[model samples]
Target: FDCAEYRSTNIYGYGLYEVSMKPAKNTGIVSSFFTYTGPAHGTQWDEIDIEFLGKDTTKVQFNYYTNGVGGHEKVISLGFDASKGFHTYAFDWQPGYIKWYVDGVLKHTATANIPSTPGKIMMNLWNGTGVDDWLGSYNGANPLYAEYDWVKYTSNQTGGSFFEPFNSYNSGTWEKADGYSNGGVFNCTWRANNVNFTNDGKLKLGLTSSAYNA
Candidate 1:
């Protein structure tokens, strides 16, 4: 059976997100719960995730990323299995810092001077490319699955104030990168850009854009 998507509103700019799930059987792709903070632009964002591997239910991967004038992405392997039973995955995301955890055990963290704004939380399950190596070759005939129990989002009520990034469409605190025009829904576009992905087939937080040099 496929898992339904979960969404959230009233999410703080900086907070902790936790997800608990009973993974599906032999699932090639399974992601922790999260939402997209709309009014998004190319690679300018923040996200945390707990991705389960099809090859080994015993291992869950943690990853996070931030998009700025330049793009960045990072992936890390957790030391424990997440599919044996119910497991909790957590992310502590703030300006310049992001941390990941499984059952309260710290797995990975990323820090940077420029931070991505907190968007909405999106929870999803899918089977696509990138699982070839992490989960092994797919038979292309069988159904691989991952299951989720529940997801929780917590905020640092007294930590700091939330800030929304600048969108080319409307004047905001941040300045748009050169050459990128504002798209609807508060997105920007820069021509002459190029791209690029894989592993576990699970979705993790990371960058997906290249810098434009004109």
Candidate 2:
């Protein structure tokens, strides 16, 4: 019954957040819960994500990237599935490192010494290629969509003092390679991959080359 892409613009207290949602069946689309680090024009930035592919609707995938002007960047993928029920998807952004999780369980982590400014949090759903195709089929006929129960964000400043202010920026200097063109000011990109969350509390991860290209 769900078709096309969707997203939520507003979020609560933390620079880092968690997303929990339900996905459409037998359709090819990406149901994602993530944050957008931006506001600057032509500037380069970084992003971390948890995407649900529509094909299997049984697994969820994780990915992260650092983008700038000169085509300098790095990306990686991890696996998990959260279908047949509602599960937690989260990212912990600290100085020099970004860690991902499912239902509070740690899955993957990325580290760097870059200083990226805090941007906005965006939770969305879209029908795209690459990553989406790996999860489902983009036949241009199957009705596909992703649903959400809630999304939460928690500050990196735990207990008392803030851990690493500079590292707080997921995309900063440490993560960037030398000679890399930091781009104009607001240069950015996004993708829709696969992930898992099952009713029985099982997590499986997957990806689509199509969504990856996007």
Candidate 3:
């Protein structure tokens, strides 16, 4: 009952990443925003973390791993309950150094074993198992949630920049899925017709009753 995750569709290198979020409040849970690429992606495990242990919403943890070796964990005192309101957390990644920030204030820096491999930006809310000492034992809280106000990333590079605003349905950037649905798991047939866009620049995927399915 305790898992929700989101990851970027594209990978990025050294840059500034930020998120405004309020963490879940309950024992043995974590709300986080981080960057990662690992053996699952056929790359050496490299990661940067900004995690909130639900046991104490007044602090957050900063950590990183390079080449699958991670022993770095720096817990920062937030001075306020993170579960009460949204706060901005950020990390600036450069060639050999990393800088962490909370609400635009610099909190920590790490210059050794920085992750250099490009990784996907990720966010997740999950409760843990078996790690009682690190995160206090689970309390069996029902229906916990972490809320994100917004997330943004700006490239530190001079030219290429970030975020190509969705002006229209660019054929080169997106394609439709049709002709098949995952066996039994998906109740609706896949069709390009269900995919649409709004004039205000929002992509829409709609579901409607289909006679063929009936």
Candidate 4:
């Protein structure tokens, strides 16, 4: 009913990471897709994020953290509910800047502390407690779902982030985690294929009831 994480097996230095997703609207829940490198890299660890705050259905979060400190937490009004339907969310990490996209529209970009360290692509669905201040608190939420149509990664985006192979979910050359954690000591329970190929192609994480995970 809580805790969800999936990361790419390989490391990506500069690439376009994207996914087609529709968040589950429940207070406190978080639906995200991004790139990251953390604790293991010490204070200089780099990370990028794209999160849907369940409470703020009409907005999305874009931010970055270097080492251990983060300052630029930008919230943009989506003018539409994230859980209403699947929307293409993406981030292109480059030499000195990072660009975020919703569908084909350019949302925003960041030029400071653009995560120098290379990291894997990650997606998570968590409705944990303690974030009630901004992300809302999960009130007796037994189960919630975050739906995704597909995910793609390309070392060279070249506007490919908004195009074909990069947009296709399962029909590509990609990989997933095969063992234990990235941040700290976590269960090696989630191997590559189990939660990786959710629904044969559609990546639906969380306590799933679909034949994909059933």
lDDT of 1 by residue, 24-76 (tens): 43534444454344334334555555666555667666555444232333455
**Model 3 vs. true fold: TM:** 0.75
Off by more than 4 A, model 1: 1-4, 9-11, 38-43, 68-80, 134-137, 140-145, 157-214
**Which candidate wins on TM-score?**
4
How do the predictions measure up, each by TM-score? Answer: 0.57, 0.55, 0.75, 0.76
Candidate 3 per-residue lDDT, tens place, 82-182, comes to 98987889999998899999999999999998888988776666556667888887665645666665667887763333543334545553345555552
Model 2 segments beyond 4 Å from truth? Answer: 1-14, 38-42, 68-81, 112-115, 130-136, 157-214
lDDT of 4: 0.68
In model 4, state the lDDT of residue 156.
Answer: 65
lDDT scores in order: 0.46, 0.46, 0.72, 0.68
**Candidate 4, run of 10 with poorest lDDT:** 181-190
Q: Write the per-residue lDDT of candidate 2 for residues 1-214, one digit (tens) a residue.
A: 1222222222222256666666554555556655445435344565566666656556666665556322212222324345566666777776677777767787777665433545445444444445442545454443233445554456655422122222122332112112222233211122222222335432222222333333
Two-way TM-score contest, 3 vs 4, winner: 4
Question: Which lDDT value does model 2 have at 135?
Answer: 46
Instruction: Predict model 1's lDDT versus the native.
Output: 0.46
Please count the clashing residue pairs in each candidate, in the order shown. Answer: 15, 55, 0, 2
The best-first sequence of candidates by TM-score reads 4, 3, 1, 2
Alpha carbon lDDT of residue 52, candidate 4? Answer: 89
